[PDB]
Amino acid sequence: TYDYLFKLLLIGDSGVGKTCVLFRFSEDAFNSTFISTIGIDFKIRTIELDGKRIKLQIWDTAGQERFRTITTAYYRGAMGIMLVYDITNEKSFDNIRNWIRNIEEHASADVEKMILGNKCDVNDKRQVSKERGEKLALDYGIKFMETSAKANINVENAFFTLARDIKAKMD
Template sequence: MAKSYDHLFKLLLIGDSGVGKTCLIVRFSEDSFNNTYISTIGIDFKIRTTEIQGKKIKLQVWDTAGQERFKTITTAYYRGAMGIILVYDITDERSFENIQNWMKSIKENAAPGVERMLLGNKCDMESRRKVPKERGEKLAKEHGIRFFETSAKSSQNVDESFNALATDILMNMTRRAAHGMKDPLDLKNSSKKGSSKCALI
């Protein structure tokens, strides 16, 4: 039986508990929203197949518990991840400050060539904003990664951000294959991307 996709990409969402990782994944995979989710215990994942540059890409999106006590569980899941999305809550400054700790965790546990992206979630809650958009853009630029502000509730930029990350992975894979590099995660990512601006609607 022929497989129904050209590539399978494992994506991982990390960030503090309560920033909306589960809501983002459910919005992306099922196009629904429920603000009464209980905290994820351990690990869960969702699947969505999307088409990028004429290729069918199966995205396996892993949700991790943000609580520190589950960190030992989540470290094993960095391995094999081709894209990692760091999520903070724009209404919670501490969740933004902790992104640096999550960056360090990626460096310690993930493959050196992994694609990364920064998301500032809950941008529908503008009146409660604590983290200016410019701070997110600046941090993303410092790390050479894409940046989006998203809302799982309104679905703003959810598809766009996941698809942008999948596109980056595919382009890296294609470029490395052209140079005879089989595993896209074997080498350090030498081409760093700039911040991608995304306007609030």
């Protein structure tokens, strides 16, 4: 027995931590090893939300351009997308604009979006200030959270938010 079924999508450059964010949230696990995703995968975790049970189907995409075509094919089904960058990698942040393009070009017009600056545990190598992240997301009308899959910061928050936000279009 479960009540709902939301399909979510993670996109962003290879290495920003999409799989770790998903694994944190799904398995409460974290791999330090970089094991690049091949094509596409998904996990399910059914959560207890607001007195109410919801099964989330979260699609994880390969960040490499080698699999770009494969991954884009999965955009139209998403009820919500995380655009992820790495706060320790300026270039991954610069690429957020391009990834916003593919969403608006291939997902549903009402798909709900959310930018995550991941690896916010790594202070000594921060290349993107939280203020630059927060104001970009304000600029796109997109919610913003800094996350750490490693430190388990705001991961549950991130998805629980995106899903209450989905639920809210119901109700």
